[PDB]
């Protein structure tokens, strides 16, 4: 067994890589297996991800909201873009983050230019607008902010230190070091 197989025996999934469809289908497959192995024991989800992806975000957003088990998110070094939404998507009272982890909340973007007629670009922009409102509505029900506050805050990159990510509501506890180590 790997370490990654050993953490999964203790119901811990790594996000680790960026949230694309390949990573989202991995995490959804891991969240549903861990739901079936013990639905009343908390899945822990370690997040060191640079973000990326919205449908892949909302694939593993909805799955960690679907499953019978409570999700404990732990931000390791980084939760940027989509991964900060997944960090807030843990169960309240859960959602740890290590003390030097940065949390980068950020409005949705298009990676590169997508061409098309203006009637096709009015739809790709009505979609990136409803991707923006869905990013802010999701992040408001998990941080307790007012979803126009998040639109003002995620208007640019807002890098949150873990101590000011629990003041923002992204996490709940900046988890302390166990032994001085």
């Amino acid at each position: 067994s790997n370490p990654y197989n050993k953490l999964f025996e203790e119901r811990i999934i790594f996000l680790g890589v960026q949230v694309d469809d390949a990573s989202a289908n991995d995490i959804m497959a891991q969240l549903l297996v861990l739901e079936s192995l013990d639905p009343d024991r908390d899945i822990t989800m370690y997040i060191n991800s640079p973000g990326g992806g919205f449908t892949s975000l909302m694939a593993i957003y909805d799955t960690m909201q679907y499953v019978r088990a409570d999700i404990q998110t732990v931000c390791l070094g980084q939760a940027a873009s989509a991964a900060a939404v997944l960090l807030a998507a843990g169960t309240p009272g859960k959602r740890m983050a290590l003390p030097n982890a940065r949390v980068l909340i950020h409005q949705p973007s298009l990676s590169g230019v997508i061409q098309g007629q203006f009637s096709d670009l009015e739809i790709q922009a009505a979609e990136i607008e409803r991707m923006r409102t869905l990013m802010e509505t999701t992040l408001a029900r998990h941080t307790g902010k007012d979803a126009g506050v998040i639109r003002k805050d995620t208007d640019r990159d807002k890098i949150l230190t873990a101590e000011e990510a629990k003041d923002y509501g992204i996490i709940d506890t900046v988890l302390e070091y166990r032994k001085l180590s």
């Binding site: 409005q107 949705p108 973007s109 298009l110 590169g112 230019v113 997508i114 061409q115 098309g116 007629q117 203006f118 009637s119 670009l121 009015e122 790709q124 922009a125 009505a126 990136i128 607008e129 991707m131 923006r132 208007d155």
Partner: protein
Amino acid sequence: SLTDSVYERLLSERIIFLGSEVNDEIANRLCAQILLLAAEDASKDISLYINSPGGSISAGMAIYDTMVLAPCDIATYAMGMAASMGEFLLAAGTKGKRYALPHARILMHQPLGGVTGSAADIAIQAEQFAVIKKEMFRLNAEFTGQPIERIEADSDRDRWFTAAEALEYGFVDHIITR
């Protein structure tokens, strides 16, 4: 060159060509030529010939503004192809002076573009794409004389015209037959 010397001799006869994609280089070359020919004789017609696969909106709006603000009557000529910004500048000629050569084909379609960046950038681009597309359709409705609701319906996708179809639609005023 040779091809620049033939264009220079037609420029002496007040015949300019839009023969490429309308980018900022060809537009500033035409806007320079329209300003130069309106400075030589302010009362003699300029014969712009359109053989264009389209181009940039703002490049063609630079040409269209210099076509209007020149005291000359810009006679336009669909020569083979007047697509996108080429049909716009074709239909932008003086009324009674917009011509199609009999086998020119006129492509009318809504502007293409590309959305880029963050969702606040894209919401500004799409706000501006709705401004550009409304003004492009307002001017095509002004040029052709068609209703703007018909302009936005026909120019949803590619809407090809022959010289005889563009005559009855309103892009050109005559078809040259000699």
